[PDB]
Structure 1
Amino acid sequence: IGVPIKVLHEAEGHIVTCETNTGEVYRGKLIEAEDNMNCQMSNITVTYRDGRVAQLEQVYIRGSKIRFLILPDMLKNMLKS
Structure 2
Amino acid sequence: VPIKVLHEAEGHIVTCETNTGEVYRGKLIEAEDNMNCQMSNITVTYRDGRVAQLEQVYIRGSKIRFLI
TM-score interval for Structure 1 and Structure 2 normalised by the shorter chain: 0.7 to 0.9
1:44-74 Cα offsets, whole Å, 9 max, x none, are 111122221100112011112221114xxxx
1:21-60 Cα offsets, whole Å, 9 max, x none, are 1122111111112242221100111112222110011201
Structure 1 or 2, whichever has the larger Rg, is: 1
Q: Give the number of aligned pairs.
A: 68
The DSSP-based 3-state class of the residue aligned with 1:64 is coil
Normalised by the length of structure 2, the TM-score is 0.82
Task: Report what 2:40 is aligned to.
Answer: 42
Q: 2-side partners of 1:34 and 1:15: how far apart?
A: 18
Unaligned runs of 5+ in 1: 71-81
Aligned partners of 1:23 and 1:48 also within 8 Å: no
Tell me which stretches of 4 or more aligned residues in structure 1 moved more than 3 Å: none
Residues 9 and 35 (structure 1), Cα distance of their counterparts in 2 relative to 1, 3 Å cut: farther
Aligned partners of 1:12 and 1:33 also within 8 Å: no
The DSSP-based 3-state class of the residue aligned with 1:23 is coil
